[PDB]
């Protein structure tokens with residue numbers, strides 16, 4: 001019995017070394033090479049495990065139901081069930097039998113080929129055949145392709161069919177002038193270390209018609225991942241990259257020949273899109289005749305993913321940002337369908353996944369506007385659009401009278417002298433300011449005074465009814481929106497600034513569209529949704545129907561009134577309720593904002609923004625095109 005326990009220890013240390021990929025330490029625990037002991041020596045065991053387990057990408061060896069007894073004086077029989085993960089799936093229910101050995105004062109394992117796999121004997125071999133799974137597509141709400149695998153015209157040059165000297169450079173000048181390429185890059189590709197005189201050295205991919213081919217140029221059709229909208233959805237969709245040996249170590253069920261998602265939805269939906277590798281893991285005769293099959297199943301291609309994104313709206317929302325820093329979110333506010341999640345500036349996902357130069361990748365990573373950032377998922381201070389939330393809270397708790405008219409003189413104000421020199425500032429000097437006037441001219445002092453009158457406790461009671469701190473059920477990495485840094489402002493100055501959306505507030509464009517959906521659902525909050533088939537989740541009684549019926553008419557005037565901050569949108573001639581905003585970010589860096597939706601049918605809602613805006617630039621100047629599209633197609 002005392003020796004049976006030391007034997008149970010060696011069986012667990014043997015399977016642990018196998019589980020850790022240390023096939024050598026497990027080899028040093030076997031017996032000496034003999035007839036009834038170990039069939040092979042140490043270096044031969046290390047190679048047989050490294051060859052076989054390495055070929056099948058065996059990982060995560062775990063055992064259960066250990067039964068260790070005693071046969072005679074020095075040999076202890078031991079058995080157990082075991083399971084492991086391979087590149088073809090999970091090998092479960094493995095009956096491992098064997099004998100131990102307890103000569104001297106320690107216990108070794110009488111190694112046998114049946115310890116690699118159960119039914120192995122002698123010089124049996126292991127075979128593995130695999131068939132790659134085609135990656136599934138990503139499609140918009142109407143079936144248009146967003147991420148697909150298809151045929152690509154790959155332009156490349158062969159050094160021999162190019163020339164000997166003078167004619168070689170003339171063809172390089174022709175290929176660099178016929179496909180919009182660099183003359184220093186064609187000679188930099190044909191002079192790498194892997195190049196041979198007769199090798200097809202690839203260059204770029206022609207995304208259109210193929211011009212005349214100079215001497216040395218040739219087109220080889222190959223299959224790869226393609227993104228139709230390209231950079232217009234690069235942050236959302238993402239890109240796939242070549243699977244490395246480290247990926248296979250983490251998840252053996254990947255296809256080391258295939259691609260893996262590196263960012264965006266391509267990474268978030270990698271398991272659903274990549275499918276399952278098919279094939280057969282068999283044991284063969286000493287000559288190669290198939291003996292016993294361990295795993296086998298057909299290749300199952302990846303499943304498609306249908307998004308709520310509108311492909312035509314996604315391209316228009318992105319193009320309207322003119323390559324400047326910003327982002328736009330468009331929703332159907334009654335259901336939450338995310339029609340567009342544009343972010344600018346962007347990167348080329350096709351060039352990123354079809355072979356990207358090391359120089360271009362550095363430009364993408366050092367660009368100060370940071371193209372890789374998903375700005376629709378980045379938290380910002382909302383600015384003056386947040387006055388709709390503050391006003392609705394004051395209407396709900398009976399602090400705001402819509403017809404009550406505050407008297408504000410000048411462009412600066414402070415509660416009392418204890419504020420030192422900080423003063424709430426407004427842009428328009430209007431003496432008589434009610435709720436309708438304050439929303440039209442975007443008056444901070446009205447918002448600040450009415451926030452302080454309301455107080456912090458009544459303010460947060462209305463704020464807590466929203467989604468501050470919640471994690472949205474979305475396949476997008478994102479931090480939850482926050483009211484402030486702590487659970488209490490502990491400052492009337494910070495309380496006032498939060499009133500008009502310039503405190504420690506952090507709300508990303510997607511969360512803003514979720515919070516502002518109350519004005520399209522009679523005060524019900526409708527959570528945003530990215531997968532088309534998913535159910536519509538809502539949140540009743542966030543603000544009162546009284547406040548919605550009061551603010552939305554005023555938001556119509558933010559567009560229609562001659563002095564409204566969004567009056568340029570009245571040129572569209574469409575029903576619009578909107579609210580602009582310009583957030584100060586502490587030189588003076590400003591973020592332009594625009595909220596807008598159709599108050600007649602609630603068919604669409606839009607939240608656009610510019611980050612670190614240039615002068616006389618705004619989200620309002622760029623919304624005319626996207627608003628015209630959403631008005632015609634989403635009613």
Ligand SMILES: *C(=O)[C@@H](NC(=O)Cc1ccccc1)[C@@H]1N[C@@H](C(=O)O)C(C)(C)S1
Nearest residue numbers: 383384427442444565580581582583584
């Ligand atoms: C809301 O964002 C308000 N802006 C401020 O309180 C700070 C500010 C920023 C830039 C210039 C002046 C003041 C108001 N809303 C914006 C807007 O709706 O675009 C205004 C420029 C009207 S100030």
